[PDB]
């Protein structure tokens, strides 16, 4: 919605594929 | 024309009965969305349908409008897919939540439509899960369902002509081990939100 | 000489302890929150303040701390209000193991306040939630005493700084009893890691 751009969330573990 | 942006929930009706059944997916879709122009504050559609189905999933696909001109294209994707009953008296209360797979080649994506041209696609998923022991309307998250799948993406966006990308979404689960929905003895319709989705671009 | 622009974007995180959701919880203690800050064409992670703005056997309201540089300024805050907490003791990173819902009653809401230095006009002030079905259950408890999933806020206003100042954020209010613990249940107290919402603070200069 604004101009900041959202973080990512937390607990998030992230998808190295 | 420096600065358009798009955020919303893209919905989607589904049909449950038991914990033990599959949900049975329902048409895509126009999708409402607030839409920005640099101070404008307006809302539009958007144009949804199915990249892919099987027995198993079906994975969504959104269209975005890029005007002629060189963009800076970045996108938030938060993957979460709470479902509420179509039918008052509880319209938009929770009733549950529809799982994803923890498949590696599941996951938030984009592509190019109507000669336009991405370039320097940066693409990055993740995922949350629940604790093993979490329980939803009498169901666990004992063979990894996930919570959650999200996305940060960014790229550039050359369009000689008005042109479109799509982004494709995370697979939505048919199979009963994804349903954590309110269990009903008649094939019960909800609404099921797809994820928030926020579109922004940047003329260059 | 150029208008400036100031954005605050994080999720503040408090740790509490709980055992069953039978029992009550207890909060841990606020303070330093990790937020991203943007000033025009720099960007950092700074800390800000929270602290409890009121506390009771039943409850505790969190409040954040904003810094106004001295000038005319517009706000605009964006809040997104859901508890999911994780065990801390959990081998693995992160697994939502529940969440802390909210009351429904019409004094919980975000809203904002003058500290230090400032005046604030022109509060405008939308405040919306999302409820739990009365039959929807997690971890074994139902939402029949219409708990909340999700309280959220779209601020905005006006302030004047003469000097550096500061405003404060009012969270919803932290929910203690048993009513509102939907955490999974444990043998003795353990430490869950809770969210406490998102928020999004922006500050436009006028001149």
């Not at chain 1, 919605?1 to 998808?15: D, F, K, L, S, T």
């Not at chain 2, 122009?37 to 409008?65: G, H, K, L, R, W």
């Not at chain 2, 320097?120 to 979490?134: I, M, V």
């Not at chain 2, 009903?184 to 671009?201: A, C, K, Q, S």
Request: aromatic fraction near 10%; include cysteine.
């Amino acid at each position: 919605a604004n101009r900041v751009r959202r973080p990512p969330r937390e607990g998030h573990i992230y998808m190295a594929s | 024309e420096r600065f358009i942006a798009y955020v919303g929930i893209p919905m989607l009706t589904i049909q449950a009965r038991e914990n033990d059944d599959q949900i049975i997916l329902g048409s895509l879709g126009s999708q409402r969305m607030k839409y920005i122009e640099d101070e404008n504050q307006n809302y539009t559609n958007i144009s949804s349908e199915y990249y892919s189905q099987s027995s198993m999933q079906a994975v969504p696909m959104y269209y975005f409008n890029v005007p002629k001109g060189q963009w800076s294209v970045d996108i938030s994707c938060e993957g979460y897919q709470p479902t509420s009953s179509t039918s008052d008296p509880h319209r938009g209360r929770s009733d549950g939540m529809i799982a994803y797979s923890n498949a590696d080649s599941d996951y938030w994506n984009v592509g190019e439509a109507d000669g336009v041209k991405i370039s320097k696609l940066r693409n990055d998923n993740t995922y949350r899960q629940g604790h093993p022991e979490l329980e939803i309307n009498s169901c666990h998250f004992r063979e990894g369902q996930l919570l959650e799948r999200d996305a940060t993406i960014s790229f550039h966006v050359e369009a000689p002509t008005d042109g479109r990308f799509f982004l494709v979404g995370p697979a939505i689960q048919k199979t009963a081990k994804y349903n954590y929905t309110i269990s009903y003895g008649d094939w019960t319709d909800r609404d099921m939100e797809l994820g928030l989705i926020t579109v922004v671009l940047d003329e260059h």
